[PDB]
Assembly symmetry: none
Homo-oligomer: 174 residues x 2
C-alpha cells in the first residue's frame, strides 16, 4: 500500500560473488564516511542477495536514512558502478511532484498537450484547465510523471522553451 517498502532499496550491478555481509559492511561504511547517517551506528540492518540475477535488496533501520542512501547511485564497488533504486512497489504520496505547465496555446487539446509531456516518460496524472462553460483551454495544465525522477528532466527540458509567441513555464506546482 501507500506506506509500504519505505526502508528498502534495490541495488543492481553488484560485484560477482560478493557476500551479503561484505555488501552490508560496504554500505554501512559509506553511510558513515559520507555523513548520511542520522544517529550513531549502522543504518543498514540486512542485505538479501539474488545471486542468479545479480541484484540485492538493502534493509535500513529508518525511513530517512533509506532516502539518504539514494545518493549512492553509481558508487563504484569492487570495480562495479552500483545501480540504486527504489523498490518498484514504493510510491511517493499523490501529488508530491505535481508540475504546473503555463503559457500553452489555447487552441491545443488535451492529447496535443500531453504529447509534449509524455516525450519524457509516462504520466500518472494530467489535466488541461478549461473554461467549464465553453470547454475552451485556459492555456495551462498540471501533470505528474509515473517515474518521479522524470520530473526534473521535464522541467529542465521544457521550462522557458519558445512556443509560438510565448515562453513555456514548467515548474513544480507547489
Amino acid at each position: 500500500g501507500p506506506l509500504g517498502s519505505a526502508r528498502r532499496l534495490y541495488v543492481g550491478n553488484i560485484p560477482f560473488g560478493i557476500t551479503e555481509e561484505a555488501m552490508m559492511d560496504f554500505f554501512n561504511a559509506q553511510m558513515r564516511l559520507g555523513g548520511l547517517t542520522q544517529a550513531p551506528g549502522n543504518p543498514v540492518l540486512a542485505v538479501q542477495i539474488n545471486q542468479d540475477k545479480n541484484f540485492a535488496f538493502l534493509e535500513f533501520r529508518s525511513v530517512d536514512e533509506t532516502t539518504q542512501a539514494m545518493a549512492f547511485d553509481g558508487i563504484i564497488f569492487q570495480g562495479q558502478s552500483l545501480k540504486i533504486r527504489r523498490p518498484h512497489d514504493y510510491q511517493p504520496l499523490p501529488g508530491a511532484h505535481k508540475l504546473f505547465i503555463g503559457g500553452l496555446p489555447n487552441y491545443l487539446n488535451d492529447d496535443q498537450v500531453k504529447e509534449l509531456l509524455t516525450s519524457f516518460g509516462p504520466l500518472k496524472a494530467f489535466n488541461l484547465v478549461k473554461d467549464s462553460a465553453t470547454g475552451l483551454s485556459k492555456g495551462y495544465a498540471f501533470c505528474e510523471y509515473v517515474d518521479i525522477n522524470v520530473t526534473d528532466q521535464a522541467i529542465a527540458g521544457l521550462n522557458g522553451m519558445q512556443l509560438g509567441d510565448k515562453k513555456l513555464l514548467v515548474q513544480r506546482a507547489s
Copy 2:
C-alpha cells in the same frame, strides 16, 4: 564455475609414489601450521594425482583459503620443492566473461534462448530475465560459457544477428 576454479590449485613436481591422502594431510597440516585457515577443520577437500605426469590438483573448501595456499610455492614435501600455481582457467576478475543478450523475441522461453547460445559450446550459467508477476520474458538474458575462450566467438557469431522481428545485442555484461 567462475569460482569452481577459484577453489583449485595446481601442484607440480610431486615425488614418485605419493598418495592423494598423504598429499591432503600434508597441505591441511601446512595450512593449520601457518595459521592460514579461516575456520575450524581442514581447508583441503580432495586431491587428484596424475602419477604419469607428476602433478596434482588440490580442491579447497573456500576461495580465500585457496588464495592463502599460493604462499606455499616452493614448499618442501618429501625433500622436494613443490610448484604451486593457479589453474589455467582461473579467473582473477570473476564474471569478466559473463554475456548480456538483448533484443530477444519475447515469446522465446529458456530452452529456446539456450539453444541459440549452445551452438557455440556448453553454458555453465544462464538466465532469461522475466517479469515475476506475469512470468513473461523481458527480452534479455545473461550467460557464461564453460570455456571462456568461446565468449568472443559467441559475440562474433551472435551480435547483430537478425532474429525475425529483432536484431540481437550480444556483449560482455561487464
